[PDB]
Subunit: 303 residues, 2 copies
Amino acid sequence: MIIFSGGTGTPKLLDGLKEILPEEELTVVVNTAEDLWVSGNLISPDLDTVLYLFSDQIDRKRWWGIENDTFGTYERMKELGIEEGLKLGDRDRATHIIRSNIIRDGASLTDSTVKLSSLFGIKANILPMSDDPVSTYIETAEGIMHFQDFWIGKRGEPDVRGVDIRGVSEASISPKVLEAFEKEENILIGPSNPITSIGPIISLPGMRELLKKKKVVAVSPIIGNAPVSGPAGKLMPACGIEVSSMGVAEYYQDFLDVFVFDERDRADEFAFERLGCHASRADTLMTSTEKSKELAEIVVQAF
Amino acid sequence: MIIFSGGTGTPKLLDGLKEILPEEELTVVVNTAEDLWVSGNLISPDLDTVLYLFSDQIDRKRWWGIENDTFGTYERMKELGIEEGLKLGDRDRATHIIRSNIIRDGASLTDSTVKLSSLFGIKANILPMSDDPVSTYIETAEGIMHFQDFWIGKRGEPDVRGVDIRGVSEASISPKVLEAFEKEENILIGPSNPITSIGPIISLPGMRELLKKKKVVAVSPIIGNAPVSGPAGKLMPACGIEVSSMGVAEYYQDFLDVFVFDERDRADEFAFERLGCHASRADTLMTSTEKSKELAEIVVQAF
């Protein structure tokens, strides 16, 4: 099956999905609207997370970066009081160095994503959403600037006014994604930021039309309870969607077949019906590889 | 005074020169024909050596890199069997990152060399020979390629045919070097590779003419005894100079005032006279900060 992933929701569900079916049959399409050239090397936060996942080297404490990694190059900056802009792991930088060398040498992102997968021995198909650049900018009253600055800089306090998934219009769906996007038929959108993570992916030209020809299942990245309190909270009304597990479903009401939401919010399920799509219940609060495998079987069984 | 430095000879004499006179009066002009963009960051091997010297952080075991440095980012490559091309220290990379960020941001090399000096608290004037790119290539029978490949790749075994200090013709002497190159009058060429280290510096347009208007003192980078057995051995006949402490002096017979050679080779000193320049004796075998300070006072007294 194919899994649209990004942020931190999906890779968590993968960690369980991988223990439910043969790796070979798994192919995750990672968002690239987050990539950014840092300290002289392209960093694909989302891509690296998946790679580090299927390579048993993901830091399971913070679900980003590499377990037991060292930060000698970083700390230097610290001592010198030079805020690099991110706490890069020495081992996690090597990745940035490798994929960058491939790219600096006329290669493509998708090319590097594979070569890495080989050095890591990953047997699953992990591919970026495209080879063409695409960066997620935020338009607000306090001016326009990279998503990194907005949340990982201003603690995510500023206002909103519209998100510009710049470059996406001219972006072309990776060829290797289209290639795998044939034999398959079961598409799944992980529980992650629908605007900034999955949005870019589906915004790609032709993509939306494609998913309409497959069996798509998505897992709500928002539970009921109190307000979202998440980074998509203020990115919901600025795009035109209501901050609710409902708005999420109505954002994919153009190709979404089976939708899954937490047993928590027992909201008006008849409302999700107003979108003409199946609906099921499952605990999306993954707090363990076990608990996660639990949600994984439901997705599988949801197909 | 001004000190032309590079390679590993000069920085060794500096370590002693710095303990003989106030740092403020010291200004070393470092060779840049060795710089090279690695893993996404410009590395000035010679410049960094001097910086790490006057910053009490030079690895005194291997006289290159940083004492007690870590190599976590490197070793990763190792494990993956990816020969990066050089063993970069995590702490030594931060330097490459910093100076590169300055440069990537419209700044100049000389600019970065200063900012670094500030973060390091260096009170001496350490400046690159130029802001314009210049790389030392080697022409041989086995083809033409970077100096790095020739020695740090082929163990320095290939033949020769001529050295091309590419880009040097169009290169312009750093403005800050010319600025300091006024008030001063005592120029010193350290005991280092005369072809690949100092050569590039003096090859700069106008430079040779300039030194002819100052009091220049140089220390032979070659002692008598058995054959040179050094990286300049085969780079001596290919340029047109004899592999001897004599050829070295005759290479600067256009501005060299006082020449200094090791007490070792008691060669025909009357031969150095045939170049119309002063000649003195001193142990150039620096095996300690002390032993080095010894040669330092002689240079000072040689002026």
